């Protein structure tokens, strides 16, 4: 599951956890490789900065 909400009015954008949580772009994450592969261009413009 990958649902990404954009951050309106200075708030940070969030991504959906496996257990239904919405987390900002911090901390330690764990991906499977196929999750990056299916969404490589959409993840490059969000995460590489």
């Amino acid at each position: 599951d990958c649902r990404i909400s954009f951050g309106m009015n200075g708030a940070a954008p969030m991504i959906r956890d496996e257990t239904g949580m919405m987390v900002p772009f911090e901390g330690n994450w764990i991906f499977p490789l196929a999750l990056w592969q299916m969404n490589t261009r959409y993840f490059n413009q969000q995460f590489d900065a």
């Binding site: 990958c2 196929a34 999750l35 299916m38 969404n39 959409y42």
Partner: protein, 98 residues
């Protein structure tokens, strides 16, 4: 059907014999708005003032603003709502599942 009705006037006129042949049966003189509106009154002619029942929300002192009397007589001064919308195109970000 050809009719032949006279002309209203604001001063007194000279009477003249006029013969007419085709009349109606009931009151069909509703489309007439007003006669000689610039004048103070109408001495000779079919007299008819401004139809006050059509301008209901002005001349009625105890009337709600947004009312109607619709099936009987249409009102020519009402309360209209004006909008300004947008119709955005169908946008979707299509993501893949592993």
């Amino acid at each position: 059907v050809p009719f032949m009705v006279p002309i209203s006037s604001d001063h007194d006129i000279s009477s003249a014999p006029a013969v007419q042949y085709i009349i109606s049966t009931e009151y069909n003189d509703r489309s007439l708005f007003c006669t000689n509106s610039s004048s103070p009154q109408t001495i000779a002619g079919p007299d008819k003032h401004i139809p006050v029942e059509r301008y209901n929300i002005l001349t009625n002192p105890d009337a709600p603003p947004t009312q109607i009397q619709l099936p009987e007589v249409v009102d020519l001064y009402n309360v209209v709502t004006r909008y300004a919308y947008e119709t955005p195109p169908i946008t979707a970000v299509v993501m893949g599942v592993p």
